[model samples]
Target chain A: DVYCEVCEFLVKEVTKLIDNNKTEKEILDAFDKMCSKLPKSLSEECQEVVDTYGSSILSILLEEVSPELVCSMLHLC
Target chain B: DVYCEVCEFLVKEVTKLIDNNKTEKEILDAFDKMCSKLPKSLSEECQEVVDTYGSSILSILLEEVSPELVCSMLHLCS
Candidate 1:
């Protein structure tokens, strides 16, 4: 029932980062940027998500995946 | 189902910060420090959880709550 708050925490973090500015490249970059931050961050907030999930969460960001998709793919919804 | 990974994320974060070094008064500061980070970090990773939950999650850190207690109290467990 309960699992992976770090995963969701990250989704929303990038979700905010995702300005959706460009349909193709820029928005895509948002996902990439988030992905980059996951590895880059010294904070556990980003690091934990990455530590547990890796490029897993950000990998879904570019795909047509929805929330539950993002959830289960990296971890679970 | 799922709810609040940020809650878990922060928990694990602080959990690591906590060496279980002391008991009373206390090393209680571990939770406080994490609570502080929640508001302090400019990263949405930390801020979104705060905006979504706030002292809500950190508040649970101090209690004798386990995963379920933590999950439900701050957001949801199941």
Candidate 2:
């Protein structure tokens, strides 16, 4: 449940930023910085991320970004 | 390439933190602050986090923590 809350906070905060009209680069930059700051996760949090919102997150992201851009964002070569 | 590097960095830093045996509360506190600092997303970055380490990250984390505590670390509740 704690894991879900963090996810909720992330979605809510990111959504708020989008609503405020922040640019993609600005958003990505901030996200990368945050990624750098995250604490070590235990296995379940990682599992929780996958089992709870894995596909849904991708689908939602696609609504706001191109597939190619999403690939770049994820850093998938 | 850039995103992968960021992910690698995250994993490395977190792994180092765990290796040092920092308390879970301390780690979670830092994570929450970082999350709060993150800027708005156009959605792609969020997807990236999921697609990149979604499952493997869990495997790595489990090596150092238990499931119940992992959930607590994520702050599923207030």
Candidate 3:
């Protein structure tokens, strides 16, 4: 989910840069090098989200699943 | 973080396309128009995710401060 934005140059570095006590705009602008970018940011919960589900976890999970998992679950004709 | 993918067309528009409880490959490849696009799909929780977070939240956010917040947080001499 949040990983969707990893490649975004702005979200990538800014995620590492801004602290929750700070505003999201402060972080976004600081990273993007743009002013007047302030907008309502999401909850502070947004930060810790990735620590539990970072790229390493995602890569492994994606690989572990089998097509048979879906095939077995299919509805009967 | 996820919504960044929204505006990129790959994530946003395609999202509105697929209904939940369908094959992940069906959804992804339906969007990608390929037979090999599937690489294991995210949880069914994926769809509910956006609906919950999909507020017009903000185009962006910036905090205003003097002398930079971090700089002030530190004891430094110029």
Candidate 4:
């Protein structure tokens, strides 16, 4: 079921999810899970980001938000 | 005093603070304050990052950490 949803078009479109509004945590989670679920090539690319920016990127997001906002957004989503 | 600390090398070195372990809230705060403090050229770059990834970036850190961590870090650093 999930496999069928992840066609070429859907795969390519997922990159838009990289943009703002979703937050760094959301983006990383998407990247990690999508990498595992995609072709080997894509997985390699995703892992590369993890190696280069995982912790650093996460740190940046933490600075931008408050603890309260973090909790509220979960419900909003 | 703070202005002298913003020399070229110091400015460049501050980028290292961009790395992980600090969390999103810390990184954004540093970027915002530094941007306001730097020269126009450097300030533009910092602003661009804020525009491009600020909200999303903050949201990410919120997920990775709990409210408790934020308060705890403040105590540690403050």
Candidate 5:
């Protein structure tokens, strides 16, 4: 569940950013920036999540599914 | 996601028992037995999962969805 965990982690973290009043554009950059900070394996996994989901992740995060459900959408769960 | 995690854990553990040639009856017993060993809070959560799902848990185990998906079925995911 590496990808699943990563997917869930990103959603939870991304949502936290939103609660902090991070703008959509700011969240987008933070999304990538967040990925950059992880260990390489998770970093790469996070990148794939970005690559695969693109801005859909951003949109979903706005009216998002649960962190767990988000990963299932990516079929990571 | 306490229920979700508990659901996932049970499915994974139950499957492990199956792989070990556990009889369905044996696994059913082990299911409750497994819950008894967890700390009380988690043990109670395990009971609710059982109370919520009933033998549907056993039937599902045989043709189970992904453990994660199983929790969604219980409406644990939103």
Candidate 6:
């Protein structure tokens, strides 16, 4: 319950960032920044979500974001 | 030219196998058998096809077949 709620919140927040009309680089930098902060952002209860859905979430995010953008976003040069 | 033809043939053959309503296990076994035969099945020219489109073909097949079946087909217990 709390896990889904927290995951929904994360998705919504990230979707908001995507919708802000920011440059792609800016949005990805924001994501990188968010990832660095994610451990602190979660409560002890939500850790289960991370453990279970971590790879699924990452895969879905990459799909939603598109692989080309993700590659560029990470500066995969 | 030949590579596209061969790849097209492979896709068509596999799609036929799927369409035949064969058991998932049978279809995957056929594919594994096909993979084993692939090098000899191809000429020197088609080796490029394998090198270039191998993973893309695998990904597409997994997508087309559904990962649940693919995992089961591979006997991935995890």
Interface RMSD of each: 17.4, 16.9, 18.9, 18.0, 18.6, 23.2
Which candidate comes out best when scored by TM-score?
A: 5
Which pairs of residues collide in model 2? A1-B76, A2-B75, A2-B76, A3-B76, A43-B61, A43-B62
DockQ versus reference, model 5: 0.03
> TM-score of chain B, per candidate?
0.32, 0.29, 0.22, 0.35, 0.40, 0.29
TM-score each candidate: 0.22, 0.19, 0.21, 0.23, 0.27, 0.19
Predicted structure with the largest lDDT when compared to the true one: 5
Worst 10 residues of 1 chain B by lDDT: B18-27
Q: If both were scored by DockQ, which would come out higher, candidate 3 or candidate 5?
A: 3
lDDT by residue (B1-78, candidate 1, tens digit) is: 323454354334333332233321232233334434343343444444434533233223223224343434444345
Cα lDDT tens digits, model 2, B41-62, are: 4244534444443323322332
Q: Compose the digit string of candidate 5's lDDT tens values, residues A1-77.
A: 44454435444443343333234444455555555655564555455545644344333323433666544544557
DockQ of all predictions against the true structure, Cα-based: 0.04, 0.04, 0.04, 0.03, 0.03, 0.02
Off by over 4 Å in 2: A22-77, B1-78
lDDT of 4 by residue, A1-77 (tens): 22221221221221222223434544444545544654564555446545554444434433434433333343321
What pairs collide in candidate 5?
A: none
TM-score of chain A of each: 0.32, 0.30, 0.28, 0.36, 0.43, 0.29
Q: Candidate 6's residue-wise lDDT over B33-76, tens digit each?
A: 33344345343323343344322332232233333332222232
Badly placed stretches (over 4 Å) of model 6 are A1-77, B1-41, B66-78
Q: Each prediction's Cα RMSD?
A: 17.7, 19.1, 17.9, 20.5, 17.9, 23.5
Worst 10 residues of 5 chain B by lDDT: B13-22
Which residue ranges in model 1 land beyond 4 Å of their true spot? A1-77, B1-3, B20-65
Q: Candidate 2 vs candidate 6: which has greater lDDT?
A: 2
The candidates, ranked best first by lDDT, are 5, 4, 1, 2, 6, 3
Q: Model 3 compared with the native: what TM-score?
A: 0.21
Candidate 5, residues B15-57: lDDT per residue as tens digits? Answer: 3433322333444454565555556646555555445543443
